[PDB]
Amino acid sequence: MIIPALDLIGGTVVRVVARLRDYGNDPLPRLQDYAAQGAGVLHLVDLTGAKDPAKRQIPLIKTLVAGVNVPVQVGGGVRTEEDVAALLKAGVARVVIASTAVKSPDVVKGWFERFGAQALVLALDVRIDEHGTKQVAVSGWQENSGVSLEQLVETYLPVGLKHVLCTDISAGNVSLYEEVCARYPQIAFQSSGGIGDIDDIAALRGTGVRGVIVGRALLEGKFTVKEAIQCWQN
């Protein structure tokens, strides 16, 4: 499926380029129109909460989830068990765990045990290094942490990992997704980044990728969610 995405900071829809462009304070109508076009899942990044978990945009997130009829996965500053629980209580379908999944795997394994694998998405940034290894990093501006995508996935398979979001931070690579999806067919991989036009979606068909996250291309009016879904399903 196509997974339309918004980044939110203080109620504002923004485009990440780190440069930020204002696309207005209307996230709910935007999300509603994404769902209206057939989206089965939506993705939100709470950039305010990522900067300071104390300022997690829970009231806004509550409104947004209430305002659509499809599950929303939400990330941004998910550091503690309490963070996960707060988002779920707000009505979020899945909590996106990013840096903490790299930093404290034994702790996050406990979260799988408490919340269940259907409630959690592990978001991993990947750099392909000179050797061709898929190196995990916690962000685009930090060095690699010294664990491969495969090694980290295999860390969480024993607690029933089901959802992994993989962003290539090294138009959009296809080989990356083909490889990992084939190796772990019991995991539903999502791809993020590199979607600049409709042909980029077509390119990911047949790779085995389950979900294609699309953010900026929808904001920039390159194509619609309906067109993305039509291309994805054909």
UniProtKB/Swiss-Prot annotation:
It comes from the Bacteria. Keywords: Amino-acid biosynthesis, Cytoplasm, Histidine biosynthesis, Isomerase. Pathway: Amino-acid biosynthesis; L-histidine biosynthesis; L-histidine from 5-phospho-alpha-D-ribose 1-diphosphate: step 4/9. Its main location: cytoplasm. CDD domains: HisA. Pfam families: His_biosynth. InterPro entries: Aldolase_TIM, His_biosynth, HisA_bact_arch, Isoase_HisA-like, Isoase_HisA-like_bact, RibuloseP-bd_barrel. It catalyses: 1-(5-phospho-beta-D-ribosyl)-5-[(5-phospho-beta-D-ribosylamino)methylideneamino]imidazole-4-carboxamide = 5-[(5-phospho-1-deoxy-D-ribulos-1-ylimino)methylamino]-1-(5-phospho-beta-D-ribosyl)imidazole-4-carboxamide. GO terms for cellular component: cytoplasm. GO terms for molecular function: 1-(5-phosphoribosyl)-5-[(5-phosphoribosylamino)methylideneamino]imidazole-4-carboxamide isomerase activity. One of its GO terms (biological process) is L-tryptophan biosynthetic process. Its EC number is 5.3.1.16. Coiled coil: none annotated. It is found in: Cytoplasm. It is an enzyme of class 5 (isomerase). The active site is at D7 (proton acceptor), D125 (proton donor). SUPFAM superfamilies: Ribulose-phoshate binding barrel. HAMAP family: HisA. Belongs to the HisA/HisF family. This is 1-(5-phosphoribosyl)-5-[(5-phosphoribosylamino)methylideneamino] imidazole-4-carboxamide isomerase. The gene is hisA.
